[PDB]
Symmetry: C6
Subunit: 30 residues, 6 copies
Amino acid sequence: GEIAQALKEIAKATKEIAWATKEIAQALKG
Amino acid sequence: GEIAQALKEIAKATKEIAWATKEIAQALKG
Amino acid sequence: GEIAQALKEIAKATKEIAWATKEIAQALKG
Amino acid sequence: GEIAQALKEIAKATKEIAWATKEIAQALKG
Amino acid sequence: GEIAQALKEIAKATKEIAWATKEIAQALKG
Amino acid sequence: GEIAQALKEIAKATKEIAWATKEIAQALKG
């Protein structure tokens, strides 16, 4: 579990960063 | 061991980046 | 396995972050 | 070995990104 | 296998994020 | 091998993102 669980948590957080970064890009374009 | 500890630290830091990036998005959409 | 699935999700999200970050850079450059 | 060392370096750098992203958010919020 | 391929893709995408983030910093400096 | 090499490349790129993100923070705080 520990290594697999940490990688799953990194995956979830990285997906959230991706979405927020897309929102920033969209805001800056208008 | 060391690998599991490092991955747990990456998971924690990535979650913090996700939170902060969401705050940036909200500020710019605000 | 679980490790491969998580890493593939991280790869996909990191590509999305790269694209969105490039869009942010282009928006700020005008 | 090498894998653990690289992951430790990634952990340190991601913590620094977390700090800087929080600083960006606060600066934008005034 | 897939694990190595995903890490190679993460490396490439992270290099692109590094470039784009440097461009953002330069744009914000004028 | 391939996995260690990709992780070393991720470590370098992540350190460069940390540098650039700090530069962004400093620019906004100016």
